Amino acid sequence: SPSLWGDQFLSFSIDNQVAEKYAKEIEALKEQTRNMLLATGMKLADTLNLIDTIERLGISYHFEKEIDDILDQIYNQNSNCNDLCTSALQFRLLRQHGFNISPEIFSKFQDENGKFKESLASDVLGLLNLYEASHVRTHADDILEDALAFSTIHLESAAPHLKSPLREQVTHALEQCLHKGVPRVETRFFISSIYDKEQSKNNVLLRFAKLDFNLLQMLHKQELAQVSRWWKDLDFVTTLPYARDRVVECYFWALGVYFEPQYSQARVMLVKTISMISIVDDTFDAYGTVKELEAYTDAIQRWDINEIDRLPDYMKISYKAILDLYKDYEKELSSAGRSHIVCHAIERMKEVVRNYNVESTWFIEGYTPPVSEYLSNALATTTYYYLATTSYLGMKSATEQDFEWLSKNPKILEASVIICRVIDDTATYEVEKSRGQIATGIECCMRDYGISTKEAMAKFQNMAETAWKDINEGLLRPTPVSTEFLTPILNLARIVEVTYIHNHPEKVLKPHIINLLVDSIKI
Numbered sequence: 001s002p003s004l005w006g007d008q009f010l011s012f013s014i015d016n017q018v019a020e021k022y023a024k025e026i027e028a029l030k031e032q033t034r035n036m037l038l039a040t041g042m043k044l045a046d047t048l049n050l051i052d053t054i055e056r057l058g059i060s061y062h063f064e065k066e067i068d069d070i071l072d073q074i075y076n077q078n079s080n081c082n083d084l085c086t087s088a089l090q091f092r093l094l095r096q097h098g099f100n101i102s103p104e105i106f107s108k109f110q111d112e113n114g115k116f117k118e119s120l121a122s123d124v125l126g127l128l129n130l131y132e133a134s135h136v137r138t139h140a141d142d143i144l145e146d147a148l149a150f151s152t153i154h155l156e157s158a159a160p161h162l163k164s165p166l167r168e169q170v171t172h173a174l175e176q177c178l179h180k181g182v183p184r185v186e187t188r189f190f191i192s193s194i195y196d197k198e199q200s201k202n203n204v205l206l207r208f209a210k211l212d213f214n215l216l217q218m219l220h221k222q223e224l225a226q227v228s229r230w231w232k233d234l235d236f237v238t239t240l241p242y243a244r245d246r247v248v249e250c251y252f253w254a255l256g257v258y259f260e261p262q263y264s265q266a267r268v269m270l271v272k273t274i275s276m277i278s279i280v281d282d283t284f285d286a287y288g289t290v291k292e293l294e295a296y297t298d299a300i301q302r303w304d305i306n307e308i309d310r311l312p313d314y315m316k317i318s319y320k321a322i323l324d325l326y327k328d329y330e331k332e333l334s335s336a337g338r339s340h341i342v343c344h345a346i347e348r349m350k351e352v353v354r355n356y357n358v359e360s361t362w363f364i365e366g367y368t369p370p371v372s373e374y375l376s377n378a379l380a381t382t383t384y385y386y387l388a389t390t391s392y393l394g395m396k397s398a399t400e401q402d403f404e405w406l407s408k409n410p411k412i413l414e415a416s417v418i419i420c421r422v423i424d425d426t427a428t429y430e431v432e433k434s435r436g437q438i439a440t441g442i443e444c445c446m447r448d449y450g451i452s453t454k455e456a457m458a459k460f461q462n463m464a465e466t467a468w469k470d471i472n473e474g475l476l477r478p479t480p481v482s483t484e485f486l487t488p489i490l491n492l493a494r495i496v497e498v499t500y501i502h503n504h505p506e507k508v509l510k511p512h513i514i515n516l517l518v519d520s521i522k523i
């Protein structure tokens with residue numbers, strides 16, 4: 001199937017004066033907001049609500065300093081808000097920021113038995129904040145064992161009769177929690193659908209939110225244009241017709257990983273890699289013969305233009321483009337003097353390809369390995385180790401030590417990869433089955449444990465839950481590396497959750513792309 005965008009994003013001219021107009025007013029709105037944070041004499045509930053709203057509006061990235069300092073004090077000053085609402089929110093914010101706040105704060109809301117007091121089933125704002133908090137738990141938070149089921153069942157019961165926009169905020173939460181959703185996608189929904197219709201809205205913050213979102217969108221649109229040009233200048237739609245045309249979608253993913261303007265170069269470098277490996281994938285999946293794929297795999301491992309001759313003409317195209325890309329990366333990084341870090345991404349790509357070849361081998365033989373062995377190859381084929389490594393390329397502050405840490409397959413990274421694999425397998429199962437892919441995960445899980453499809457998918461679901469608790473734990477201080485390098489990994493897992501919601505294709509991404517890159521927010 002072809003791209004349904006056309007050349008809609010191929011050309012974008014920024015309204016220079018509009019940008020300056022917005023940028024100038026934002027600085028003023030930025031200062032007003034800062035003073036709202038640096039403000040003195042505020043209740044706990046009010047301070048946490050301020051932080052939460054600024055974050056949901058997608059503007060918190062301007063007050064990384066301010067918000068941190070405030071949450072730090074709250075952590076240290078351990079409060080006693082007998083309000084479920086403020087407690088759950090206090091818990092979530094701190095946890096999301098790496099503050100290992102004790103889950104004992106919830107015991108006051110549950111009986112001797114250790115279960116949530118059902119007397120709270122009429123505190124909708126409490127249930128909602130508890131619901132959101134339930135997704136930020138780790139393995140040491142069994143006190144929150146049934147917080148999801150509890151808050152969920154009562155919110156569903158309450159929802160139909162709630163006033164707007166609360167009703168829509170709740171209904172949306174039940175379909176997509178905040179912690180596991182894509183930042184820009186959730187920010188878009190909050191600004192446009194909730195806060196804008198909020199009667200108690202703060203006009204300074206709402207205007208600040210809309211202007212910023214729209215200004216960043218102009219930046220994103222410029223980037224997607226440069227990329228759409230770069231992709232067009234390669235012309236893989238006529239030269240390599242078996243490969244998918246999804247550069248726009250590949251950009252949405254780079255955007256899910258990070259949206260900040262400071263990560264402009266990284267995001268562009270990333271989208272290029274995602275698009276490139278997207279071709280290599282289709283090369284192993286739809287086209288290419290066994291004999292052909294081994295030569296491709298082999299050439300990638302050697303990594304030298306001298307190997308092109310050994311490859312069929314069509315694989316010569318892909319292969320040459322791959323080295324040029326990494327050649328382009330080294331040049332961009334030359335200025336900063338970080339040109340050397342490119343090798344890390346390269347070594348990961350080889351790993352993906354090496355495993356792509358293995359995947360096809362298993363397909364031909366009709367091999368159905370045990371889960372242990374299956375995952376030993378299937379994890380890298382998610383490309384997440386490769387994408388996460390690529391993430392650091394454009395991040396001007398990423399050091400050799402950071403790449404060093406990442407190369408050891410840290411648990412947070414490992415968990416992100418597992419979520420991707422597991423979710424993908426549950427969704428694409430029924431499809432790949434009919435294609436003769438008896439090498440799929442759910443198939444291996446059924447043959448290994450001697451269980452049905454449901455049980456297998458259930459076992460996989462638990463693997464993703466375990467994986468999320470691990471990501472949440474991996475964010476707690478002291479973090480192995482700066483949070484700056486953990487977020488991309490966190491975002492990769494969120495993208496998976498967002499793409500395979502309810503485990504269909506670009507039909508799921510279309511609305512997000514329109515709301516994020518096509519339509520601007522009406523002021």
Ligand SMILES: CC(C)=CCC/C(C)=C/CC/C(=C/COP(=O)(O)OP(=O)(O)O)C(F)(F)F
Binds near residue numbers: 278281282382383
């Ligand atoms: C599970 C997904 C789609 C999560 C979103 C992020 C992502 C993986 C970005 C990289 C792009 C790729 C997508 C391949 O998608 P698809 O061809 O369906 O995979 P499969 O052939 O292994 O089933 C690549 F081709 F590179 F593998």
Ligand SMILES: [Mg+2]
Binds near residue numbers: 282
């Ligand atoms: Mg594939």
Ligand SMILES: [Mg+2]
Binds near residue numbers: 425428
């Ligand atoms: Mg799959």
